[PDB]
Amino acid sequence: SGFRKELVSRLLHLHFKDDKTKVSGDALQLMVELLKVFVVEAAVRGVRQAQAEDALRVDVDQLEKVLPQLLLDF
Amino acid sequence: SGFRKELVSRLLHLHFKDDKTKVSGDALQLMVELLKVFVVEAAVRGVRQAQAEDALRVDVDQLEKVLPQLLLDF
Amino acid sequence: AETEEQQRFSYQQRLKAAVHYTVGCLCEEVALDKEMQFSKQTIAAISELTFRQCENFAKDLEMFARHAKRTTINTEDVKLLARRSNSLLKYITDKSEEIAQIN
Amino acid sequence: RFSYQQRLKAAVHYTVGCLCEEVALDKEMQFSKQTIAAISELTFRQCENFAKDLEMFARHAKRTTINTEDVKLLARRSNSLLKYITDKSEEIAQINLE
Amino acid sequence: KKDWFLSEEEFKLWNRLYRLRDSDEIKEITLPQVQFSSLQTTGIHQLSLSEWRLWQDHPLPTHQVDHSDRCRHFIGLMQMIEGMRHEEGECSYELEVESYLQMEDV
C-alpha cells in the first residue's frame, strides 16, 4: 500500500500558514514515500520493542517506549 | 559564566562535513547564547522535578523524566 | 462560526480516516514480514501519530522553502526533513533521483 | 593524553558544571555528579545536531557561511527561543554598530 | 577572551568535581545514538526516553523555553494512548473515525 499524492497534498495544505504556499509535483511524490517510511519505522520499532520484552504482539505500551526517539529522528 | 565563543566555534567545526563551512561572528554569538539556554533549561527543569518529588538533590531519575519534553522543545 | 467549526472538524476526520486506513494497510504488511501482529490500539496510535506528524512536516517544508526564498516547496526541502539519519537521507535521495527520471 | 575531542568535552563538561552550580545556588537545589555529566552529554550531542543543521540550512540558501537566519531557523519550534534569539540579534546589532 | 580549552585551574577543578571515574558507581553516561530498523553494560548508564512514560501524558514544568508544537503533539498522543490502554473491545478510535472514510482518498 501507500499514500496518494492527493491525500498527502490535503494534509500539507491543511497546516500551511501562508495560503500562497504550494508544493511541487516531485516534492509531493517524495512526501508520499517519506510518509510511508515514517509509518514503517514506527511499526518496525514497535515490533523491536515488543520482541525485546519477549511480548507476542505490539500493544500501546511498546509503541510508547519508541515514541520520543521516533519524533526526534524526524 | 557561560560558553566561550572560541570553544563553541570549535564545537561546531567539529561536526561540519564541508571544510569550507564558516560561522559569522554574530551567528556564533547567538550559538553561545543558545547553548547556555539549553543547559540552564535542563538544569532548572530537573530542579522543578526534584522539588515535585520533595527530593533534596537532582539525580538522573529526575532528569530523565523531563528529557523527552526537553529534547522535543529543542 | 458554529458551522465553520463543524466543517473544519468533519474535514479533519475525513483526513484522519484516510490516514488510518492507509496506516492499517502498511502495518498489515509489516506484520506479515516480521511475523507479529499489532493491537487495534497500536494501529490507531500510529495513525494519529502520522496525522499529527504531517503538521510538523508541513510547517517545516514551508519554512525551509521560505528560507531559500521560494514559495513553492521542492524536492530538497523534503530532504531536509530526513537529515537526522544518514541512511534515511540516503534512502530518500535514492527515491528522489528515481522519481526525477520518470517524473 | 587526551584526544582533541576529549578536551572539547571536558571543556563543555566544566562549563555545564558551573552553570548547574549557579542554578543550584539560585534555585536552592543540589545536583548529583551524574546529573551534571548527563546534561554535559546532552549538550555536546545537542551541539552536533545544531552544527549539522546550520551547515545544511546555510547550504540550503546557497551560502557557505552560517548566518543569523540559520540560527533563527534552529529555534523555529519555540516562541520563547525564537523571541530571545531575535532579541539577542537586536542587542548584537546595537553593540556591533558603534 | 581566553582559550577554547580549559586552563590549568579549570582542568583541576573539572577533574575533582565533575569528571566521572572508573571507581564511581556510574563510570560513564551515554545517550541512545539511534538507528533506522527498516532501512538496514556495567557502570554505564544509558539515558532513557521511555522509562518515565507515565509522566508524559501531562505537560511538564517550563523554565525559559515554552513547549513546542511537536512536544504538545507528543503529550496529546500520550493522552490518547492512556485512554485506550485498557480497551475493552473494539477500538474507540476506529469507530470515531471510520464513518468519515471516503474511498476516493484511498
UniProtKB/Swiss-Prot annotation, chains A, B:
Disulfide bonds: none
Statement: the UniProt record of this protein carries the keyword Signal: no
Signal peptide region: none
Any Pfam family: CENP-X
One of the record's GO cellular component terms: Fanconi anaemia nuclear complex
Keyword list, A-Z: Acetylation, Cell cycle, Cell division, Centromere, Chromosome, DNA damage, DNA repair, DNA-binding, Kinetochore, Mitosis, Nucleus
Compartments (UniProt record): Nucleus; Chromosome, Centromere; Chromosome, Centromere, Kinetochore
Taxonomic superkingdom: Eukaryota
Protein family (similarity comment): Belongs to the CENP-X/MHF2 family.
Subunit structure: Heterodimer with CENPX, sometimes called MHF; this interaction stabilizes both partners. MHF heterodimers can assemble to form tetrameric structures. MHF also coassemble with CENPT-CENPW heterodimers at centromeres to form the tetrameric CENP-T-W-S-X complex. Forms a discrete complex with FANCM and CENPX, called FANCM-MHF; this interaction, probably mediated by direct binding between CENPS and FANCM, leads to synergistic activation of double-stranded DNA binding and strongly stimulates FANCM-mediated DNA remodeling.
Name the record gives this protein: Centromere protein X
Gene coding for it: CENPX
UniProtKB/Swiss-Prot annotation, chain D:
Tissues where the protein occurs: Ubiquitously expressed.
GO molecular-function terms, A-Z: chromatin binding; DNA binding; protein heterodimerization activity
GO BP terms: cell division; chromosome segregation; DNA damage response; DNA repair; interstrand cross-link repair; positive regulation of protein ubiquitination; replication fork processing; resolution of meiotic recombination intermediates
Keywords from the UniProt entry: Acetylation, Cell cycle, Cell division, Centromere, Chromosome, DNA damage, DNA repair, DNA-binding, Kinetochore, Mitosis, Nucleus
Lineage: Eukaryota, Metazoa, Chordata, Craniata, Vertebrata
Source organism (scientific name): Homo sapiens
Its job: DNA-binding component of the Fanconi anemia (FA) core complex. Required for the normal activation of the FA pathway, leading to monoubiquitination of the FANCI-FANCD2 complex in response to DNA damage, cellular resistance to DNA cross-linking drugs, and prevention of chromosomal breakage. In complex with CENPX (MHF heterodimer), crucial cofactor for FANCM in both binding and ATP-dependent remodeling of DNA. Stabilizes FANCM. In complex with CENPX and FANCM (but not other FANC proteins), rapidly recruited to blocked forks and promotes gene conversion at blocked replication forks.
Family: Belongs to the TAF9 family. CENP-S/MHF1 subfamily.
Subcellular location: Nucleus; Chromosome, Centromere; Chromosome, Centromere, Kinetochore
Name under which the protein is recorded: Centromere protein S
Superkingdom classification of source: Eukaryota
Cellular component, GO annotation: chromatin; cytosol; FANCM-MHF complex; Fanconi anaemia nuclear complex; inner kinetochore; nucleoplasm; nucleus
UniProtKB/Swiss-Prot annotation, chain E:
Coiled coil: none
Post-translational modification: Phosphorylated; hyperphosphorylated in response to genotoxic stress.
Compartment list: Nucleus
Tissue and organ expression note: Expressed in germ cells of fetal and adult ovaries. In fetal ovaries, it is present in oogonia but expression is stronger in pachytene stage oocytes. Expressed in oocytes arrested at the diplotene stage of prophase I during the last trimester of pregnancy and in adults. Expressed in the testis.
Region (Interaction with CENPS/CENPSX): 1-106
Top-level lineage group: Eukaryota
Record's function text: DNA-dependent ATPase component of the Fanconi anemia (FA) core complex. Required for the normal activation of the FA pathway, leading to monoubiquitination of the FANCI-FANCD2 complex in response to DNA damage, cellular resistance to DNA cross-linking drugs, and prevention of chromosomal breakage. In complex with CENPS and CENPX, binds double-stranded DNA (dsDNA), fork-structured DNA (fsDNA) and Holliday junction substrates. Its ATP-dependent DNA branch migration activity can process branched DNA structures such as a movable replication fork.
Protein family (similarity comment): Belongs to the DEAD box helicase family. DEAH subfamily. FANCM sub-subfamily.
Quaternary structure and partners: Component of the Fanconi anemia (FA) core complex, which consists of CENPS, CENPX, FANCA, FANCB, FANCC, FANCE, FANCF, FANCG, FANCL, FANCM, FAAP24 and FAAP100. The FA core complex associates with Bloom syndrome (BLM) complex, which consists of at least BLM, DNA topoisomerase 3-alpha/TOP3A, RMI1/BLAP75, RPA1/RPA70 and RPA2/RPA32. This supercomplex between FA and BLM complexes has been called BRAFT. Forms a discrete complex with CENPS and CENPX, called FANCM-MHF; this interaction stimulates DNA binding and replication fork remodeling by FANCM and stabilizes the binding partners.
Name this protein carries in UniProt: Fanconi anemia group M protein
Organism: Homo sapiens
Span within the parent record: 675 to 790 of 2048
